Each structure stands twice: as structure tokens, then as C-alpha cells.
């Protein structure tokens, strides 16, 4: 879950 | 009394963080699905989604944010993202027009524009009053970015694990803000209390937005107009 | 030999279904995130998402589709949606330009436009050759819509439960198509075999698209540019 | 799951 947030958070 | 070297380094990095993540030309806006005058939900969904990416970028440059755990970083952003967008939007807000002006009449948003994105005066009235009272504060950019960082670094949010660490970070930012106002803001004896009141108002605005966002997210013909990032950040999934 | 009353009623409803769901003015396209020349992924994501909504509308008007179970309706659409978009896009395709022209140079898509949406010549070469060979068939609108309905109503797709019912529906549509071509299409003795070959080519195109779509969907900086409907239909969730 | 498809399929 939160796939995009993890990517954006580096 | 004056500000320490470490206190102004915090201010330096926070100011740079905001300049790098707030583009005063608004030229990126022509990439959003166009406004239409729920006529306005596609455009405002794209606007908010773009703004979330900038808030994540700003957050990442707050001293100490990136050293928090991934979950705490997510927790703080899922709870505070809409508040920081409300705070950061004050930069485009005009007292004269009572609306947000983003370089072009196509990207000028009045209250009625936001009703065509599925929201009601129960949210839009306090929001506009929030913006006007915040604009009347005439904050220095230093104070504006400190308040965004303080808002973001609130430990009293659902999902946060390291209460102690987040509070210490927020404590240092509040110290900076109080000192900055006393030394650098002529006539600001009452300013710090007013700014902390605005943080209270944002919680109320957040609460009301979450309520009205549930209506959107529960009707698939509206939720399909949102973006995947908006669905994630404003959604109810917990890590 | 001639066509029966029931056979032409099928043709009638399928033609009406397509006219109601394919807008030759393409005026809705100004609502998509604009094209940019993965520069083109926002625009093509919106294009495909819009086209999926039209395929669902077309499907709902195919005789007997709406009487299938919700799961079978989902199964058939998740497996065939990209194929029907490929078939229906032939209407905007030009032999002269080798591209798809949708009422305006902004909405004229060449092969290089689609490479800027994350795809490769491994998909785009067979796709363009598919379109040109399909355009050379010079299908009557009757034949075009019958082929879309036949493609949609294939029982040999993952997830389908009522194999027997879907096949009977597809059988009747094939009967209609074979009879229409023999009676109404001068010189079409070889046409039905060619059209069934095109259905084979679509499976190959589908396979390659699914492969390249996995790359997009696994990189969050690209998948975040997609729409919630595209994520659903092209995603791997099973009912 | 398939929330939008269900809604679109009526
Ligand atoms: C976003 C920013 C700007 C304006 C902000 C605004 C004005 C439009 C309406 C807005 C988005 C509110 C509305 C409740 C949100 C609804 C969201 C969904 C429909 C998903 O519920 C909240 C803030 C409001 C400016 O463009 C500029 O200052 C950059 C800044 O970041
Ligand atoms: C959609 C339609 C039309 C053109 C279709 C096209 C031309 C552009 C590229 C396209 C979408 C292909 C590409 C592989 C898809 C990628 C999708 C993601 C990036 C998600 O993988 C597939 C078909 C292709 C016309 O506008 C008109 O005929 C209406 C019709 O419905």
C-alpha cells in the first residue's frame, strides 16, 4: 500500500 | 536578543525548500485537465494532486523529516497534506478578489468554482475566512514557511509512532518562530499566538474537508475523476 | 439468400450502440490533459480512459451482454477492452498519414507520440500494420460493429464462467456477420476469413500491450499518471 | 474491488 508515497519519499 | 546560527540555518533551509517547491509562474497549470465553469472536479483534482507532490518535496527538505521512519513520514503527510495546501494557497489568494489568482483568468478560483468540485459552503465559508484572516497577518516568508513546517511536524496526528521525536522537531521550529517574530517582526507581540490559532482553524478545516471528501470518494462516478496520488493521500488506508 | 428479421435487428441495435458511443466530432478531447511532444502519457491515459467508458457503454447495448453475470461482464471487459479500443480506433486512422487523426493537429497521434507514452516498436509496429490492413478491408459500418461485438463476446478469455452462454451469443453474431457479408458485401467471399484473422492479430497485440503496461504499472512515477478507471480495467485484480 | 466498473455497468 501507499506505493506512490513510498516512491515520492525516495 | 537575537537569533542563533542554528536557528537561522533552519530558516535558510526552510525558505530554500519552499522556493524550490512553489513556482510563482504557475506555468505547470496548463498541463492540468482544463477548468470548466461537477464541472471543476477534474481541474481541481489535478491541482491538488500536483500540490501534494510539492508538499512531499517541501517535507523532504525540513530538517529531520527524512530521518523519521517511512510510516511516520506517510502518517504526517496523510493527515497534514490538505492543511499545508490550504496554508500554501494563501500565497495566490487576493483580498481584493476574495479568490486565488494563479497567473491567468482560467486559473483564477472563486468560491463558486469549488462548489462545482463537490464541496459546500460548510467548508468553503470557513476556508475563505481562514485565507483572509491569514492574509491580514502579513506574514514574512520566513514565518510562512515556519508555519508550514510546524503544521507538518505535529505529533498529535493519527498514525504517528515516534511522538517524542516529532515533538522535539516541532518544538525547535516553534522556538525559531517565536524568536524570529520577537527580533525581526516589528509589532509582532501578538503574532505568534495568532499563528497558533490558525493551526487550530486548519484542524477544523481538515475535519470538514475529510467529511466532504468521503462523499466524493464513495461515489465512483466522482472518485474516478480523482488522481491515484489523491486517492492514496486522502484515502483511509493505514500502514 | 437474404438476412432474417432477427439478424437485422441485431445489426440495427449494434449500429445504434456504436453511433451513441463514438463521437465523430472528438470535441470531448479538449478535456483531456493536453498532449506534449513520458511526455504523452497523461494525454494518452486520458484518451484511453475516456475510450474505456465508451466501450462499456457499447457493451451494455450488445444484445444479451447485460444479462450475463456482473463478473462475466467484468471479465470480458478487462480482457477485451484494449482490443476494442484498437479496433474502434481504426475509424480515425488514415492510410495517407499512417496515423490517427481526431479533428485537430493537437489530437493527431503518430507512432512517435505513443513512444512518448512508454511503449516500444515491439508493440507499435504490429499495431500500425494491423490498422493499415484493417483499413484496407474497407469494412461496412455493419461489419465493423459486428466485429467489435464478436471480439467482446469471446468465451476464450480468462475469468469467464458462463462459457456456454457467451459462446452462443458470439455464435449468433458470427452467423449474422457471415450472412451480411455474403448478401450485402459485393466481392466479400474472402472477407469473413480475413476479419477472423484480425481477431487473432488483436490477441497478439493484447499480449504485447499487457507486457508493456506492466512496466508502466510497476513504476509509481508512471502509474500515478494513469486514471483510476485505467488502473482498474488493465489491472490484475480478479473477481 | 472493481468499484468503478460495477458503477459503470449499472
Ligand atoms: C493548491 C493551491 C492553490 C489554491 C488552492 C485552493 C483554491 C481552489 C480550491 C482548493 C484546492 C480547496 C479545496 C477544498 C480542495 C478540494 C480537493 C478535493 C476535490 C479532492 O476534495 C483547498 C485549497 C483551495 C493555488 O493554485 C496555489 O497557491 C498553489 C496551491 O498549492
Ligand atoms: C482511442 C481511440 C483513438 C486512437 C487510438 C490510438 C492512438 C493513440 C495510441 C493508442 C491509444 C494505443 C496505445 C498502445 C494505448 C496505450 C495505453 C496505456 C498508455 C495505458 O498503456 C492503443 C490505440 C491507440 C482515437 O482517438 C479514436 O478512434 C477513439 C478511439 O477510441
Rounded to whole angstroms, the Cα distance separating B79 from B90 reads: 19
Q: How far is CA C225 from the centre of its chain?
A: 22
* CB-side neighbour CA atoms (13 Å) of B77: 32
Residue C233 sits at the chain D interface (C-beta within 8 Å): yes
Instruction: Tell me chain B's radius of gyration from C-alpha atoms.
Output: 18
Distance separating the N- and C-terminal Cα atoms of chain D: 15
Check pocket membership of B184 for ligand 1, CB cut-off 6 A.
no
* CB-side neighbour CA atoms (13 Å) of B6: 4
DSSP B137: T
C50 is known to lie in a ligand binding site: no
Using a 10 angstrom Cβ sphere, with 0-12 exposed, 13-18 middle and 19 or more buried, the burial of residue C67 is: exposed
Distance from the C219 Cα atom to the nearest Cα atom in chain A, whole angstroms: 9
Q: What is the CATH number of domain B1-238?
A: 1.10.565.10
Q: How far is CA C5 from the centre of its chain?
A: 27
Instruction: Tell me chain A's radius of gyration from C-alpha atoms.
Output: 5
| Residue found by looking up cell 470518494 in the block | B217
Sheet holding C108-109, edge to edge: C93-94, C99-101, C108-109
Does the CA dihedral C43-C44-C49-C54 come out positive or negative? Answer: positive
Chains C and B make contact, 3+ CB pairs within 8 Å: yes
Q: Resolution of the experimental model in angstroms, please?
A: 2.0
Residue B220 sits at the chain A interface (C-beta within 8 Å): no
Distance B153 CA to ligand 1 centre (A): 21
Amino acid at each position: 500500500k501507499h506505493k506512490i508515497l513510498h516512491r515520492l519519499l525516495q | 536578543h537575537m537569533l542563533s546560527d542554528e536557528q537561522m540555518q533552519i530558516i535558510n533551509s526552510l525558505v530554500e525548500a519552499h522556493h524550490k517547491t512553489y513556482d510563482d509562474s504557475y506555468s505547470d497549470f496548463v498541463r492540468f485537465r482544463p477548468p470548466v465553469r461537477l464541472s471543476m472536479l477534474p481541474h481541481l483534482a489535478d491541482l491538488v494532486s500536483y500540490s501534494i507532490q510539492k508538499v512531499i518535496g517541501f517535507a523532504k527538505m525540513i530538517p529531520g523529516f527524512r530521518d523519521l521512519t517511512a510510516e511516520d513520514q506517510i502518517a504526517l503527510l496523510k493527515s497534514s497534506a490538505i492543511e499545508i495546501i490550504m496554508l500554501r494557497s494563501n500565497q495566490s489568494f487576493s483580498l481584493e478578489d476574495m479568490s486565488w489568482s494563479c497567473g491567468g483568468p482560467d486559473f483564477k478560483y472563486c468560491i463558486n468554482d469549488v462548489t462545482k468540485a463537490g464541496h459546500t459552503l460548510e467548508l468553503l465559508e470557513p476556508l475563505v475566512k481562514f485565507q483572509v484572516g491569514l492574509k491580514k497577518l502579513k506574514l514574512h516568508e520566513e514565518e510562512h514557511v515556519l508555519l508550514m513546517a510546524i503544521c507538518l511536524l505535529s505529533p498529535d496526528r493519527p498514525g504517528v509512532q515516534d511522538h517524542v521525536r516529532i515533538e522535539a522537531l516541532q518544538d525547535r521550529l516553534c522556538d525559531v518562530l517565536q524568536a524570529y517574530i520577537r527580533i525581526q517582526h516589528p509589532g509582532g507581540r501578538l503574532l505568534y499566538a495568532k499563528m497558533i490559532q490558525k493551526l487550530a482553524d486548519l484542524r477544523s478545516l481538515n475535519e470538514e474537508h475529510s467529511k466532504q471528501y468521503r462523499s466524493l470518494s464513495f461515489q465512483p462516478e466522482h472518485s474516478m475523476q480523482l488522481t491515484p496520488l489523491v486517492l492514496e493521500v486522502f484515502g483511509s488506508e493505514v500502514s
